[PDB]
Design a protein around this ligand. Structure first.
Ligand SMILES: Cc1ncc(OC[C@@]2(c3cccc(F)c3)C[C@H]2C(=O)Nc2ccc(F)cn2)c(C)n1
Length: 309
């Protein structure tokens, strides 16, 4: 019945470019799944790629796979049909997992930046242990799961031809705004500022400093320059892809914009593009790894050769 009502709605409100959205979501799904699985496989199969940065990259790819499997189809269905179709339990699950994984990814990138800063900029050049990396990953996951509990709490399937949509139901008109201010500060603003500061210091230390005399330090500097360039490009892509969705969420929840405007077409186009951009970044990270890491490129080629021959 709900599907029939969608057919009535989509007929009376015909959208021009649903097919390009479907094609883009399918391409993003396939590319993200393949690339993140290949990243995990490449790091886990070989030991020369087993670095703390690569452990954090593996955690990021695991979160990306979780989002791609559990959250991408639901987001596509909601953006196409504007209805939920999945039920109260799946609704309390899927946005919760999506927000948890977004926090996990941003704080994993922050952990990478902090470890690189400790190794490069700190006067002691700390070398992190695998125990510390695994503990950091575990605490990131636990904190992300804890802080997103109210997000899963406020998800409700409203039933307001009409449609059934799962959205955020709050008691007051102030609590959502404070919660979303905190959400924006935790997921996008503060981690991005800290990572920008850390990578600016790293860039000064690696590209604005004299070349040492010891050959081992020279090789270390070259390797760290390549890795830091890859990390900075990954951070820039992440910031670009997550800027629109975070800004739109702030404008809709905190400032209460897009409410009294009857121009839902442009607003919905921007919202669905921002939704697509998150999964697009999830798909683009492995491509960045392939095009900026020689070891990752070689291991992707090796995995392709094994799977195809
Ligand atoms: C359709 C759809 N609606 C809202 C969406 O994002 C809205 C939210 C969000 C804000 C800022 C950054 C984020 F990263 C995610 C609040 C999260 C949610 O409610 N997440 C959520 C909701 C439904 C869903 F299927 C999956 N995730 C998405 C991304 N897709």
């Amino acid at each position: 019945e709900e599907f029939l009502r969608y057919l009535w709605r989509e007929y009376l409100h015909p959208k021009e470019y649903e097919w390009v959205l479907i094609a883009g979501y399918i391409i993003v799904f396939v590319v993200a799944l393949i690339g993140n699985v290949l990243v995990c496989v490449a790091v886990w199969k070989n030991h020369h790629m087993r670095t703390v940065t690569n452990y954090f990259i593996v955690n990021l790819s695991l979160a990306a796979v979780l989002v791609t499997i559990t959250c991408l189809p639901a987001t596509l269905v909601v953006d196409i049909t504007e209805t939920w179709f999945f039920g109260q339990s799946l609704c309390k699950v899927i946005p919760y997992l999506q927000t948890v994984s977004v926090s996990v990814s941003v704080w994993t990138l922050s952990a990478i930046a902090l470890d690189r800063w400790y190794a490069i900029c700190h006067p002691l050049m700390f070398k992190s242990t695998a125990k510390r990396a695994r503990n950091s990953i575990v605490i990131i996951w636990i904190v992300s799961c804890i802080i997103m509990i109210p997000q899963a709490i406020v998800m409700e399937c409203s039933t307001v031809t009409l449609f059934t949509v799962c959205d955020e139901r709050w008691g007051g008109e102030i609590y959502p705004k404070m919660y979303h201010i905190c959400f924006f500060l935790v997921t996008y603003m503060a981690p991005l500022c800290l990572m920008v500061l850390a990578y600016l210091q790293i860039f000064r230390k690696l590209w604005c400093r004299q070349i040492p005399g010891v050959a081992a330090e020279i090789k270390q500097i070259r390797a760290r320059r390549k890795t830091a360039r890859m990390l900075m490009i990954v951070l820039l892509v992440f910031a670009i892809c997550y800027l629109p969705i975070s800004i739109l969420n702030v404008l809709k929840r905190v400032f209460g914009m897009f409410a009294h405007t009857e121009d839902r077409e442009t607003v919905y186009a921007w919202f669905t593009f921002s939704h697509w951009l998150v999964y697009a970044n999830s798909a683009a990270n492995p491509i960045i790894y392939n095009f900026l890491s020689g070891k990752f490129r070689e291991e992707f080629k090796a995995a392709f050769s094994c799977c195809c021959l």
